Structure formats: structure tokens, C-alpha cells
Design a protein around this ligand. Structure first.
Ligand SMILES: *[C@@H]1O[C@H](CO)[C@@H](O[C@@H]2O[C@H](CO)[C@@H](O[C@@H]3O[C@H](CO[C@H]4O[C@H](CO)[C@@H](O)[C@H](O[C@H]5O[C@H](CO)[C@@H](O)[C@H](O)[C@@H]5O)[C@@H]4O)[C@@H](O)[C@H](O[C@H]4O[C@H](CO)[C@@H](O)[C@H](O)[C@@H]4O)[C@@H]3O)[C@H](O)[C@H]2NC(C)=O)[C@H](O)[C@H]1NC(C)=O
Ligand SMILES: *[C@@H]1O[C@H](CO)[C@@H](O[C@@H]2O[C@H](CO)[C@@H](O[C@@H]3O[C@H](CO[C@H]4O[C@H](CO)[C@@H](O)[C@H](O)[C@@H]4O)[C@@H](O)[C@H](O[C@H]4O[C@H](CO)[C@@H](O)[C@H](O)[C@@H]4O)[C@@H]3O)[C@H](O)[C@H]2NC(C)=O)[C@H](O)[C@H]1NC(C)=O
Ligand SMILES: *[C@@H]1O[C@H](CO)[C@@H](O[C@@H]2O[C@H](CO)[C@@H](O[C@@H]3O[C@H](CO)[C@@H](O)[C@H](O)[C@@H]3O)[C@H](O)[C@H]2NC(C)=O)[C@H](O)[C@H]1NC(C)=O
Ligand SMILES: *[C@@H]1O[C@H](CO)[C@@H](O[C@@H]2O[C@H](CO)[C@@H](O)[C@H](O)[C@H]2NC(C)=O)[C@H](O)[C@H]1NC(C)=O
Ligand SMILES: *[C@@H]1O[C@H](CO)[C@@H](O[C@@H]2O[C@H](CO)[C@@H](O)[C@H](O)[C@H]2NC(C)=O)[C@H](O)[C@H]1NC(C)=O
Ligand SMILES: *[C@@H]1O[C@H](CO)[C@@H](O[C@@H]2O[C@H](CO)[C@@H](O)[C@H](O)[C@H]2NC(C)=O)[C@H](O)[C@H]1NC(C)=O
Ligand SMILES: *[C@@H]1O[C@H](CO)[C@@H](O[C@@H]2O[C@H](CO)[C@@H](O)[C@H](O)[C@H]2NC(C)=O)[C@H](O)[C@H]1NC(C)=O
Ligand SMILES: *[C@@H]1O[C@H](CO)[C@@H](O)[C@H](O)[C@H]1NC(C)=O
Ligand SMILES: *[C@@H]1O[C@H](CO)[C@@H](O)[C@H](O)[C@H]1NC(C)=O
Ligand SMILES: *[C@@H]1O[C@H](CO)[C@@H](O)[C@H](O)[C@H]1NC(C)=O
Ligand SMILES: *[C@@H]1O[C@H](CO)[C@@H](O)[C@H](O)[C@H]1NC(C)=O
Ligand SMILES: *[C@@H]1O[C@H](CO)[C@@H](O)[C@H](O)[C@H]1NC(C)=O
Ligand SMILES: *[C@@H]1O[C@H](CO)[C@@H](O)[C@H](O)[C@H]1NC(C)=O
Ligand SMILES: *[C@@H]1O[C@H](CO)[C@@H](O)[C@H](O)[C@H]1NC(C)=O
Ligand SMILES: *[C@@H]1O[C@H](CO)[C@@H](O)[C@H](O)[C@H]1NC(C)=O
Ligand SMILES: *[C@@H]1O[C@H](CO)[C@@H](O)[C@H](O)[C@H]1NC(C)=O
Ligand SMILES: *[C@@H]1O[C@H](CO)[C@@H](O)[C@H](O)[C@H]1NC(C)=O
Lengths: 483, 486, 479
């Protein structure tokens, strides 16, 4: 007897997917949508390396703590990496005004340039510029001080009025930092500033603040009962800043001209830097930006996949290894032997035997599933952003609001991703079930009376069929010689 | 021989939709789910017109900058519209305390009424009330000052202690604003206030602050080295506010009795206002709220379609236009019928009495009702809370500004993804549905005409027996007398 | 002649669901996905009862308003419940610094220990410790004061310098509260403090502030033109706090050692407490947390279903009830069988030995298992973290308040839309599924009886050969 069979692919694949109706379905071909690995390194974003702070936090780096590396020239960075629990910040204890705010300002800086705003050798001719050192800020076992500030003191029994101004002719924003010293007793205030009641005044076109030292005994920090409060402001292009004091000023020595870029952010990381590039950086390492979802870390920088709590997001592209009754229905098994398509034919006649795929229906199915995967992947809108937000000890409400935002996006993206994969995996299998059922009915319609339907997807020809009648039948031309 | 064919509609439509399996599919009918047009005007929200500030920002308007129009009547507004050239604010340089907070609080009011809190002519018998004008607040080429504040100065060589109180009897909140002058040198401090050390004190039942002038040389803004700081508080009904100073006070002259309503916001727009109503205002113009999505602007006020980055959201309602999951459409019935123009699905008959198309009304009306219900569900399930998306943050609120941007951008990402895929997937489902309606019509006829006709394999049945117009009507209305012909 | 029929289940159910194509479809079985009821009481979260403040707000409780002495002995809680009449707070008028911030801090406290930081009887030997009472803080018709603070005044014509330190040896954070008095006139300043210009100083390793009294005429609140501003700080373990003053200090008397727990929150509720447990508390009452969605209240504490504006989220699990896409149900098999009560799909046989219905167990069991897996996926994929939705903002934080409102409202719109459409679309898919299982059941037998029977067109086959009960069982068993 002669036979033409319609059937589908099977292979040695062990891939499993989940579907809305069935868990743990072994499938022939599949695509993973979930980034779940990282390279364990810090990499370049947008071509530039990050600003690496090493032993310091931003306070110590921006103030110039003697244990931190100085930036002498103009530099650029993609994001900032500080390590956890950096211990070199404000070596002299005090309050850093709007510290988190300043950290956020430095996260959106494309270029950054240190310059000597009030040069130490020439700006203070009637004050002592070389005695302002302390053991709290020592380096290599010798006392020192912040490299960007200058602790002025009395000279020859007097601390005269000082008035120092600076005009921003840099055609960009200038970040100016300064300090105010608060002694632990009036003896030290008298010794250093030759006055009991001093003041500091700092003004620009849009900044204006007056400081008066407050003297009291305090618990010792870094063996210091005194305090220095740190302050900063952004001087607009063309604007001037005026410093006026008769005591206690920790004066600007170096300041920073800066250029703004894309908003970036700060990564806390114990990971080391490497000679890699990336479109998306996480605290434990860089991740590929090709898939729509990732489960490595919710706080990322770059053009990043959405963070999900999922551990598996596997999308079926092939077949069971149903809704339309053929696959796992009346055609109960796949053909490992057919290795050139998803759907096709098996012939058995006197002229020879073997499997062959139907190129038309397989190519249509391959092209459609490809469009489906590309839509799940490429419809994902991806802007360059920095997720992280920093809040101080009196911003717990803002911190919890930020956590409620990140967590809600996580719940929405996790649920929708899980269910999308479950439902569309079901749809993809029905699509294959319907492509083979339509292939069967196409041949049945052509083979109207010339064959018996065996009920297994196979038709036994009455008309004697060689290897020549079939090529016309699989090419869909038939002339409906009874044995 | 006589023949009855099953087929589906085709027309001259050029609409294209995308589906999960195929992009750019030509279809007979489709619906747009994406608002992509606005009317270019500012409209009334919740029945009320916005406050239009024109040349002024809220600061200049509320202080009474001499270049701003004063409000003589009691009025109401749903939101505030300032223009990109709103440049007239604090004409005398200084800090406006909690400015953004005041902008948000003033953005929608049930009633608003300016009134003379401390009449200039009668409240300060021992101070100079006529010398406090400056070129920084010039008007008509003459020095001037804010119309709602009064710059008190010394009179006859003395600036006496002042203590002025006001009881809120307005049975609503009163917005009281005031200022503090900070001279640029001690000579000016002496000349105007006859003291080097002055203070200002302002107290209510829940507001309590003391100000002392700080004198220093400062860079000149609008040719002023001095500074004036502006302050405000909302005095609750029945409460008292007390001003105490011996110098430097920029005193309240007019205040505002107001009732605030549900929180609104500020629109920055160069669009003109019109006598239109809307549920959703956008900076470039009002938009309809009938569709679930819009791509006009992310920052809107009202009950608004969700903002998406999509450029096209077209939902198929009809069929592939050919002038498949179930094998019929674009399968064995490979083409549509331009000739059938009164339904989606139907028949072509040819017998000795004539030929022509006819739509199957039952199955067509069923499909129209389902697709209608499907489109209405996609549209009407969209809950949109009244919201004012915009948020203003000052130079020290950058983290807050980025948190607000992360919220708007996260919602944009969720809604764009969900909108695109919903249309991609439901477009596929709608086409499967039409394909399955044609299969069931074809199979319905095949069951009726069991052996009395040959299946040609293209949607057509070749009758063995002669079939007239009562027989053809019998097949199309599903009362085919099968035994009669066997 | 002998007949075998394929059909589907029908019952007396009146449940209705909506589908994307058709509203209000009567179905045989369904599951509710929407929690829409609550028990009307306050319950224990994570095993611990809430702190009920009753007549007091948090200011009155933490400061020790004399009308809150019944709250001085509560030490552990899961969340805080204030009532709509919580009116006893700062009985002496003034500003409470970072009050909302402190309310959020106390929302995340596991254990709480009040302790006498500066004992009134022994810490102030040269000041008057018994005169600092006022009618603004009355108790039992006698002037009084906060039970956790001490209003120090001059003794015998002088208010001497004071310096008091405290070392946190509690091995946990110590919440320290204090105040600064601001009289309305300089006569009262001299009377209480023997000084016109005083100062207060409070310092630790990370806190540093100096306060100066401001003397001015003020409107009277609770008959007081004076003011007391309230302050606090969290003292780190091992750190020292130093109080220094020569006047106007309202000194700490008791402080609080606290241990943080899971971040929780504050509920305002008129509901009474009961001896119940819940994984989710709402202001009107506790709710079940089993379903993925609830419509009771958007501001919840616990592991909570997502809040939706929906009034009905019913998912069909069974079939159209007749007491489609694949053409059988409501197609050529126009009705369901109330008689078949042992399955969703099955057969009716009629031959010379008898008649009756029989469910096809394989196809029914396969369908029941698949629909079960689907219902469980919709439910169990819902990630539910312990959260406290609520956020409190003061009169100068409207922008923050409206940003929090935009966040809550955005999540509500996303979840409502997605829930409604998921149910409409999966209800359609579920009904399509049943239509397809009966079509495949019909087609299986039609292939089996290729020439031996006439297809009647209603799901029934008229046997040509006489078919007995072993022939019938083989057709129903596919043998
Ligand atoms: C309650 O709290 C108040 C605070 O509000 C206390 O008031 C303060 O008390 C302290 C001590 O009681 C006062 O400090 C003293 O100041 C005098 C005045 O010194 C000045 O006057 C002289 C010239 O006019 C000169 O002697 C001084 O020179 C000092 O400073 C320079 C700095 O370079 C240095 O070179 C010198 O060597 C001197 O150090 C200065 O110009 C000062 O003379 C006192 O010295 C005494 O104390 C120190 C330390 O104890 C000791 O070393 C000396 O031997 C000497 O015995 C001292 O420093 C402060 O001025 C007060 N402040 C106010 C506002 O009144 C009050 O005392 C507290 N009461 C109680 C009961 O505790
Ligand atoms: C370091 O910093 C301190 C504080 O910042 C400065 O101290 C101030 O210095 C100014 C300038 O000398 C002082 O102002 C002066 O006040 C004198 C007194 O004026 C009052 O009394 C007279 C007569 O009773 C009245 O006519 C007058 O209207 C006032 O009521 C004035 O007479 C001075 O004017 C002289 O200088 C100006 C220019 O500056 C001329 O135009 C005049 O013609 C006149 O010759 C002057 O205005 C001020 O009092 C000081 N403050 C304090 C708190 O003492 C230091 O000067 C500064 N530098 C140094 C080196 O210490
Ligand atoms: C920069 O960072 C380093 C590392 O954190 C700092 O060195 C550390 O300084 C702390 C504080 O002084 C030391 O702790 C103290 O040790 C001393 C002596 O043992 C003791 O008296 C204190 O009670 C406390 O235990 C710590 O041991 C020390 N560690 C090392 C490795 O040196 C340094 O101070 C920082 N310098 C600047 C300028 O920021
Ligand atoms: C600033 O103060 C320092 C220390 O008080 C002065 O340093 C002294 O300088 C002389 C030379 O002029 C040396 O002989 C001393 O040994 C230095 N003392 C110390 C402790 O190093 C310094 O001179 C002062 N600055 C100016 C400009 O006079
Ligand atoms: C109101 O706004 C106008 C325009 O912003 C101001 O006029 C400008 O004033 C500056 C002086 O600082 C000049 O440099 C410009 O040439 C002016 N522009 C025009 C078009 O005249 C005006 O001063 C503002 N007035 C007040 C009271 O705020
Ligand atoms: C005007 O009011 C002030 C304050 O009420 C009176 O007293 C002065 O107050 C300031 C504080 O702002 C102190 O620095 C002064 O020392 C006070 N003057 C004294 C004590 O004589 C002032 O007396 C009042 N003016 C008149 C004319 O009564
Ligand atoms: C505790 O709260 C009550 C009510 O909120 C406070 O005031 C009572 O209010 C009404 C009159 O307005 C009456 O019940 C009593 O006359 C009021 N009581 C008193 C003592 O005035 C009460 O003052 C609050 N107590 C404290 C210490 O804050
Ligand atoms: C999933 O299927 C694989 C075979 O494909 C099997 O080895 C494994 O145990 C299954 N896991 C289950 C049923 O949980
Ligand atoms: C103070 O005297 C020293 C003496 O060595 C001198 O070097 C310094 O320049 C003087 N300070 C001045 C002139 O401001
Ligand atoms: C889309 O379809 C239209 C109409 O058939 C056709 O003209 C156009 O070339 C197609 N291509 C794209 C990219 O839209
Ligand atoms: C808004 O809808 C109305 C009613 O359908 C319509 O007349 C109007 O043109 C629409 N406007 C815009 C801008 O779409
Ligand atoms: C100052 O004195 C003149 C003449 O006595 C008088 O006209 C004027 O009103 C006085 N100033 C004030 C504020 O009354
Ligand atoms: C107020 O000041 C002006 C100067 O601008 C002066 O001419 C006038 O007389 C003064 N009036 C009083 C009452 O002092
Ligand atoms: C069906 O068509 C026949 C032929 O004209 C007609 O006589 C009969 O009334 C129709 N039955 C219906 C519409 O139910
Ligand atoms: C829905 O259908 C039922 C019949 O099962 C009917 O009683 C009811 O009135 C219909 N409408 C609503 C809103 O329930
Ligand atoms: C404190 O003051 C009260 C009343 O003012 C008085 O009865 C008491 O004896 C005083 N005690 C001391 C120690 O001064
Ligand atoms: C101080 O006040 C107490 C309060 O009772 C009093 O007994 C004593 O006599 C007063 N005088 C002195 C010097 O202690």
C-alpha cells in the first residue's frame, strides 16, 4: 500500500515552559525573556568610565579629605560608584547641608573641572593660611586638612574683616563649597579669631545666608568636640559670589565648574572595575540590555530591562515535544526524523520512503512567531534612567514613598510578565495545532475520494502513488486508475 | 449546474493594523484608540475657566507687581495658566518662601476675594507710607512698588515700634502676605529705619516667625543690592495675625479671602483661552477623554486618557481586505467579495433564474454586536481619576523632581507596553473570530446539503439537483429540505 | 435504531460573568476574584495587636499629655490606630518639629521602653521642678503638664547654668524629646528664668542645635500666648547627648529605647478592636487576603490584595448554562444536559438494553485540571509584600501629598483596567475552550463510527448496526 502522512517536528530538546493550562510542558524550541545573569564587574556606560570614589564617599571626595584622590583637571564620568560604608568623608565632624541634594546634583554632570577660586598664596594677606591643620584630618601620620578648603586663623593678634568675591566667567555652573567652624569653648574662639562674636556672610544673585558660630561642649567625634558645618551653592554663569567674615570661615580654596548631561546616578558596589562596555549597570555587575525583563537588582543605571521578581520567563517558539485536535490528538506524536521544518509529510510507496517538511506552512509559522517574539521584546520602551534615590534620617516618609513606587512597578511588571508568558505560550501551541490541522484538511480536500482516511493523520491511496504524484500533492496541484 | 458559495466582505478601505503574527494588515474596518489631536486652546475644567496670568507669574500677580492686572471682583478658577513669557514676578530681588507650595495651593479656588487688610491711608499714622517706591518696580517710567504691600519708612526722624493685628472674620481662609527688607549697607538701614538692629515678628495661632535684617554687600539684581524676602500664611477663620516690627517690614496692604478646592495645578501654555468645556486640559490644548490613550502630552490636568509613547493604536473591527487560524478566510475561501456590500459574511448563488450576492444577516449581526461590545470594553473599562500631573520643585528639591519623573515615566512605560500589546493581540483575536464565523457558516451549509451537492473546496457547493430561488432561500435561512432531493 | 449523543453539562446555576464579546452570560461554575467584604473590626497583624491611641494623637502619647496616661504602659505593636476623635496632643501650644517624620518613625517600632532619662527628683538640685504646671494641660481639674517632660524654673531668685548628659547604654536607638519655652512678654521671662537673654543647647555626635527664646505678643491658644516648641532626636547606641541651658528649657524626664520592626503604619478608624487575626487591615475593617484584588479601601496595612475600583470580577470556570468559536456549544449541539451530573462533557446512549447519561472522565478531568491551573495562576502570581500605603503630610507639603496621591491613583488605574480586561478576555478564552473540548469529543466519535452510523446533526449518531453496551463502552472509551 501507498501512504502520505502529515505530521510535525520532534527533537532531543529538554526545554520546558509553563502555560496557562499546564505546567512543565517540554517543547522543541523556546526563547528566554529574562536576564538573570551578570558579569560581576563595573563597566563603562555610554562610552565613559564611572567616577570611582574608592575609600571615600562624596563628602570626603568633594571636600578633599586627605585620604581621597584629587581631581586636578577636567574629567567626565557616566555614573558614580562609591563602595559600601566608606569611612573617609568629613574627617572633621559637622553637618553637611543638603548632602543628598548635592549627591543628586553630581549625578547629572557630564564634565567637571577643579579650579583655584581663592588662591591660598595670595588671597588672604592679613590672615594666617598655614596653621589650619588638625589631627582629625591627618594623612600618612601627619596632621592636615581638606584640600579644597582653607581654615583661616588670626595673624599677629588680629583676625581682620575679610571680603572676597568671585565672578563666574566660566560660562557654566560653578559649585562653591565652604565651611563654618564652631569651637567647643570660648577660649578657642578667642585664640583663633580674637573675638567672641563673629559672623560669616555668603551672597550671590540667588543665594544669601548668614552664619554665627555657636559655642558649646559636645561629645568628641574623631577626638574633636568642635564642629565644622559644610555648605555649598551653585553659582550661575556670570554671577558673583561674595564672602564676608570676621571669624570662623572655612574658606573656599578650590571650586568646580560643571556641565550637565543625562541624569545618571550613584552605584554602591563592592564590584571592581573592568574594561567592559554596557548599556545597563547594576550594583553586582553589568547586564545585557536585549531582553525586556531582569531579576538581578531593582536599582539600575542605563537603558535597562524592567526588574521582576520572576525566576523563569521562558517563551515557547516551537511545539509540544489540543485546542484544534491534531497535535497530541489524532496525530499523537512528532517525527524526530523530519529535521527540516515544523510541519511536513511522510511518504511510503514502492519507489522509496522518508520524511519531508512542508516549506510553505513552516515558513509562514516561523515568520509569524518571529514577529511575535520581536513584539514582546521590542515594544518595551527603554529610556536611560537611574532608579536610585537617597534620603536622610528625617526623610523616612520620602524614602518609603520611593520604596512604594519601586515596589508597585515591580508588582505590576512581575504579574503582567508572568501572565503574558503563560497566556501567549498557550496561544503559540494552539497556533501550531491549527497549522497542522489546516495542512491535514488541505490534503484531505485535494484527496477527495482517491484515498482512505486512516485517522492517524495519514491517508492510504487507492490510486497508485509513486514518488511523482506526491510532489504535485505537496505542491497543492491534484487531478482527482482505481486499483 | 447550480451553485451556492460562502464568502466574506471586501471594500476599497486602505486601513492597516498590526497583529502579533503580522505587521501592516489591510482591513475593511477599524477603530482608533489613541487620541492624537487637541483643540489648541485653554478650556474650562469642571465648569470654571482657569486663571490666566499673561505677562505675570503667580508671584507678581499675588504680590501685585505694578505690571500685573489686579483682581477687583470675587472669582473662582479650576486651574492656573501662565505663559512662557510670564516674566513679571518679584521686581525687587529676594526669596519667596515656599513659593511652589503656594502655587499648588492657589491653583484651584472656589472663591477668591482681594480686600484691604490694613488700609494704607489710616493704619500707620506715625510712619511714612508714601516714600516706599523703587525703580526696580517701575511702572509707566516712574518708580513704584507692589500694589498689595506697603513699604513703611521712618517719618520725621523716627521709625516707631508698630504692633498691628487682624482678626479673620471672613468665615474662610485669608491669605496674608508680607515682606522683610534687607539693606545692602548700614547707612541705608539708619536712613530708612533709624536703627541698626531691627526685627520683624509675625504670629498667629499656628504661624510663628521672627525676622532680623542681614546687611551685607550683594551683587545687584534689577540694579538692587538690597533684598526683599517675601512670606505668607493662610489665616484660618476666626484666627488673629499680629505684626510687630521696629523696622524693615514690608507690610500687608491687601489680603485675599479664599476657599480652596480640590487640588489642581499650573499649565504653561501660549494657547489662547476659549469658551469651551473639557474634562482634560493639556499644555498645547484640550483633548477628548473618550479614548483610553493619548500621545499629546504627559503633563495633563483632569480626567484624561493615559499618556503613551505610541504613534498609532488602530484596532481592527472588520476583516482582512482581500478584494488563518480556522482555515477559511485566506484559506480555502481565499478572497473577499466587493459585490457583497451589506454584510460581513454571506452567499453567492447562481441558478437558472439569476445570480447575485446576499449577506447572511444573522451571523453578520452577531459579529457586529460582539466586535461592538469588544471595542466598548477596551474603551470604557478605563478608569481615569481626576489628576494634575505637573509638579514644581525648586533648586534644592532635585531628588523630589527625579522621583516625580520616575513616577510619570514608569506609568508611561507600563501604559505604552500594555496598549501596544493589547492591540497587537486583540487584533489577532478579532481576525481569528471572523475566520471562525466564516468556517461555521460554511460548515452550517455543508451539514444542510449532506450529499445533494459536491464540495468544490473553495467555499462553493455544486448542486446535483436543480435549486430554484425558494430552494436557495431555503439554504440561506437554514431550512433546506434535504429528503426532498435525496 | 440505536443512538449515541455528545453533549455538555447544564445545571440550575444563575451565576453570570461578562466576556469580551458578550455581557451577562449565565454560566455553570465560576470563581470570584474580588474581595468586597470586611469584618468591621481592628485586628492583630503578624500576631500583635495595634496600639490604640483613642482620644489621643501621637504627639499627646509620645509627650505624655496628662489625658493619655493609659498609653504609657503599651510596649509592642504591629500598627497604630488613631480614632477620628484623637484630639489630645500638644496641650501647650507650639510647633512640633518634624512631627509627621516622627509619626512615620514610630510606625516601624517592634519594642518600646519608656525610661526615666533625667529623674525629676534628683537631676535638678538648683532649679524648681514643681512649678512647671499649667491650666492648658489640666488633669482632674488641676493644672498639670506632660508626663515625659519637666518644665524647669528659677529657684530662689536665680536660674543657674545647667549641663546634663546622657550616655545611650540601651544598645538600641533612644528617642529623646525636649522643648523650648517662648514667653509672650519679658516680665514672664524674668519671672521664670531671671534672665532676659537665655539660650538652650542640645548636642550629640550627630545632632547640634542652639535655641533662642523669642519674646513677642501672640494670640492665645488654650489661653496661652506663650509657646513651647517640641523637638526630638534619635540617639545612636553608645552616643552621648548633652543638654545645656540658662533658661527656657523643657527638659527630658522620660525617653524611649526602641527597636525597629517591619515598616508599618497608622490607621484612622472608628472600628473597635476584636480578638481576630488578619494579614491585611483596612480602616473600616480587616479583609481576607486570598484573592488578588479588593475594593474596600486603597490605604491598607499588611499583605494586601491590590485595590481596584471594580465592583465585580467573576471568572467563569464552567460552561454557558443552557438548561461559539468552535461551533458545538450553542451551535449544532444547541443545549446542555441537566441529566449529566457527573462531568462537564459526556455521552447519552440509547439502545435495546437501556438509556442514560455518562460523563467522559478523561476529557472532563483534563479540562478541570487545566481550568484549575488557570484560576490558580491568576491568583497565585500576585506578588503581595507587607506594605503600609499611607503617607501623612503637613500644611506646607501639599505637593508631596499630591505626588503620593498620584502614585496611589496610578496604581489603582493600572490594576483596575488590567483586572477588568483580564477577566473579560479570559472568560472568552475559557468558554472557547469548552466549545473546543466538545467539538473534539464529537469529532473523535465521528471518526470512530465512519460508515457505521448516520450523523443527525445535533450531536447524535443513529447506529446502523445494533450496538450493545460493550460496543457503546468501546466507543466511549475509544477502543
Ligand atoms: C554660666 O555660663 C556662662 C556662659 O554664658 C558663663 O559665662 C562665661 O564664663 C567664662 C568663665 O567664667 C568667661 O570666660 C572668662 O573670660 C575672661 C575675660 O577674658 C577676656 O578679658 C581679658 C582682657 O580684657 C583677658 O584676660 C582675656 O584673655 C583670654 O583670652 C586670650 C585668647 O587668646 C588668651 O590669650 C588669654 O590667656 C586669656 O585666655 C580675654 O581677652 C577670662 O579672663 C577668663 O579666664 C579665666 O578662666 C580661664 C579658664 O577657666 C583660666 O585659664 C584663667 O586663669 C582665668 O581664671 C575666662 O576665660 C566667659 O567670658 C563668660 N561669658 C559670658 C558671656 O559671661 C558663666 O561663668 C557661667 N556661670 C557659672 C557660675 O559657672
Ligand atoms: C569691620 O567690620 C565692622 C562691622 O561690619 C565695621 O564696623 C562698622 O563700621 C562702619 C564704618 O565706619 C560704622 O559706621 C559708621 O558709623 C558712624 C556713626 O554713625 C552714627 O552716629 C553719627 C553721629 O552720632 C550720625 O551722624 C550717623 O547718622 C549715625 O547715627 C558714622 O559717623 C560713620 O560715617 C562715616 O563714614 C562714612 C563712610 O563709611 C562717611 O560717608 C561719613 O561721612 C562718615 O565720615 C560710619 O557710617 C559702623 O558703626 C561699624 N559697626 C559697628 C558695629 O561698630 C568696621 O568698620 C570694619 N572695618 C574695620 C577696620 O574694623
Ligand atoms: C580614613 O579612613 C580610615 C579607615 O576607616 C580611618 O582610620 C580609622 O579611624 C578610626 C577613627 O579614629 C579608628 O577607630 C578608632 O581607633 C582608635 C585607636 O585604635 C581608638 O582610640 C578609637 O576609639 C576608635 O576605635 C580606626 O581604628 C582606624 N582604622 C584604620 C585602619 O586606620 C581614618 O581615620 C580616616 N581618615 C580620614 C582623614 O578620613
Ligand atoms: C601662622 O602660624 C604658624 C604657627 O602658629 C606660624 O608658624 C611659625 O613660623 C615661624 C617662621 O615665621 C617658625 O619659626 C615657627 O616654627 C612656626 N611655628 C610652627 C608651630 O610651625 C606662621 O608663621 C604663621 N603664618 C604667618 C604668615 O606668619
Ligand atoms: C516686567 O517684565 C519685562 C520683561 O521681562 C521687564 O522688562 C525688561 O527689563 C530688563 C531690565 O532688567 C531689560 O533688560 C529688558 O530689556 C526689559 N524687556 C522689555 C521687553 O522691556 C520689566 O522690567 C518687568 N517689570 C517688572 C515691574 O517686573
Ligand atoms: C521697641 O521695642 C523693643 C522691643 O520690644 C524695646 O526694647 C528693646 O528690645 C530689643 C530687642 O529687640 C533689645 O535689644 C533692646 O535692648 C531693647 N531696649 C531696651 C531694653 O532699652 C524698645 O524699648 C521699644 N521702643 C520704645 C520707644 O519703647
Ligand atoms: C483633651 O481633649 C478634650 C477634647 O478634645 C479637650 O477639651 C475639652 O473640650 C470640650 C470643650 O471644647 C469639653 O469637653 C471640655 O470643656 C474641654 N476640656 C478642657 C480640659 O478644657 C481637653 O482640653 C484635652 N486635654 C488636654 C490635656 O489636651
Ligand atoms: C518536568 O518534566 C521533566 C521531564 O520533561 C521531569 O523530569 C520533571 O520531573 C518534571 N517536573 C515536575 C513534574 O515537577
Ligand atoms: C604677621 O607677622 C609675621 C612675622 O613673621 C609676618 O610674616 C606676617 O606677614 C604678618 N602678617 C601680616 C603682615 O598680615
Ligand atoms: C503597508 O501596507 C500598505 C498597504 O498595503 C503598503 O502600501 C505599504 O508598502 C506597507 N508597508 C509598510 C512598511 O507599512
Ligand atoms: C471630540 O469628540 C467630539 C464628539 O465626537 C467631536 O465632535 C470632536 O471633533 C472631537 N474633538 C477632537 C479634538 O477629537
Ligand atoms: C511729620 O511732621 C509734619 C509736620 O508736623 C506732619 O505734617 C506729618 O504728618 C508728620 N508725619 C506723620 C507720619 O504724621
Ligand atoms: C515721606 O517721604 C517723602 C519723601 O519721599 C517726603 O517728601 C514726605 O514729606 C514724607 N512724609 C512724612 C509724613 O514724613
Ligand atoms: C425560508 O425560505 C423559504 C423560501 O422562500 C421561505 O418560503 C420560508 O418562509 C423561509 N423560512 C424562514 C425565513 O424561516
Ligand atoms: C442578566 O441575566 C439574568 C438572567 O440569568 C437576568 O435575570 C438579569 O436581569 C440580567 N441582567 C443583570 C444586570 O443581571
Ligand atoms: C517651687 O515653686 C513652688 C510654687 O512656685 C513652691 O511652692 C515651692 O516651694 C518651690 N520649690 C523650690 C525648691 O523653690
Ligand atoms: C530655696 O528654696 C527652698 C524651697 O523650699 C527654701 O526652702 C530655701 O529656704 C530657699 N533658700 C535657700 C538659700 O536654699
Amino acid at each position: 500500500s501507498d501512504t502520505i502522512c502529515i505530521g510535525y517536528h520532534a527533537n532531543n530538546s529538554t526545554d520546558t515552559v509553563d502555560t496557562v493550562l499546564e505546567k512543565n510542558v517540554t517543547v522543541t524550541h523556546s526563547v528566554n525573556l529574562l536576564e538573570d545573569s551578570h558579569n560581576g564587574k563595573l563597566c563603562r556606560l555610554k562610552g565613559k568610565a564611572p567616577l570611582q570614589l574608592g575609600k571615600c564617599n562624596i563628602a570626603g571626595w568633594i571636600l578633599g579629605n586627605p585620604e581621597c584622590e584629587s581631581l586636578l583637571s577636567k574629567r567626565s564620568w557616566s555614573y558614580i560608584a562609591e563602595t559600601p560604608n566608606s569611612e573617609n568623608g568629613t574627617c572633621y565632624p559637622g553637618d553637611f547641608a543638603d548632602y543628598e541634594e548635592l549627591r543628586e546634583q553630581l549625578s547629572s554632570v557630564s564634565s567637571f573641572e577643579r579650579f583655584e577660586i581663592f588662591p591660598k598664596e595670595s588671597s588672604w594677606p592679613k590672615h594666617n593660611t598655614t596653621r589650619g591643620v588638625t589631627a582629625a584630618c591627618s594623612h600618612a601620620r601627619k596632621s592636615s586638612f581638606y584640600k579644597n578648603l582653607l581654615w583661616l586663623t588670626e595673624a599677629n593678634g588680629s583676625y581682620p574683616n575679610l571680603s572676597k568675591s568671585y565672578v563666574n566667567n566660566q560660562e557654566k555652573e560653578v559649585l562653591v563649597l565652604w565651611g563654618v567652624h564652631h569651637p567647643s569653648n570660648i577660649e578657642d574662639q578667642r585664640t583663633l579669631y580674637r573675638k567672641e562674636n563673629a559672623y560669616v556672610s555668603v551672597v550671590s544673585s540667588n543665594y544669601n545666608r548668614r552664619f554665627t558660630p555657636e559655642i558649646a561642649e559636645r561629645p568628641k567625634v574623631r577626638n574633636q568636640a568642635g564642629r565644622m558645618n559644610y555648605y555649598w551653592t551653585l553659582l550661575e554663569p556670570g554671577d558673583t559670589i561674595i564672602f564676608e567674615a570676621n571669624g570662623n570661615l572655612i574658606a573656599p580654596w578650590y571650586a568646580f565648574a560643571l556641565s550637565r548631561g543625562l541624569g545618571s546616578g550613584i552605584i554602591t558596589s563592592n564590584a571592581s572595575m573592568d574594561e567592559c562596555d554596557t548599556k545597563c549597570q547594576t550594583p553586582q555587575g553589568a547586564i545585557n540590555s536585549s531582553l525586556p525583563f531582569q531579576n538581578i537588582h531593582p536599582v539600575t543605571i542605563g537603558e535597562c530591562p524592567k526588574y521582576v521578581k520572576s525566576t523563569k520567563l521562558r517563551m515557547v517558539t516551537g511545539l509540544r515535544n489540543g485546542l484544534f485536535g491534531a497535535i497530541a490528538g489524532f496525530i499523537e506524536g512528532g517525527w524526530t526524523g523530519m529535521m527540516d521544518g515544523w510541519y511536513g509529510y511522510h511518504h511510503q510507496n514502492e519507489q522509496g520512503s522518508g520524511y519531508a517538511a512542508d516549506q510553505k506552512s513552516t515558513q509562514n509559522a516561523i515568520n509569524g512567531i518571529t514577529n511575535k517574539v520581536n513584539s514582546v521584546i521590542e515594544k518595551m520602551n527603554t529610556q536611560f534612567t537611574a532608579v536610585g534615590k537617597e534620603f536622610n534620617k528625617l526623610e523616612k516618609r520620602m524614602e518609603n514613598l520611593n520604596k512604594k513606587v519601586d515596589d508597585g512597578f515591580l508588582d505590576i511588571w512581575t504579574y503582567n510578565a508572568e501572565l503574558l508568558v503563560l497566556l501567549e505560550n498557550e496561544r503559540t501551541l494552539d497556533f501550531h495545532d491549527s497549522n497542522v490541522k489546516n495542512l491535514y484538511e488541505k490534503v484531505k480536500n485535494q484527496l477527495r475520494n482517491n484515498a482512505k482516511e486512516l485517522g492517524n493523520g495519514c491517508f492510504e491511496f487507492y490510486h497508485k502513488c509513486d514518488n511523482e504524484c506526491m510532489e504535485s500533492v505537496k505542491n497543492g496541484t491534484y487531478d482527482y486508475s482505481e486499483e
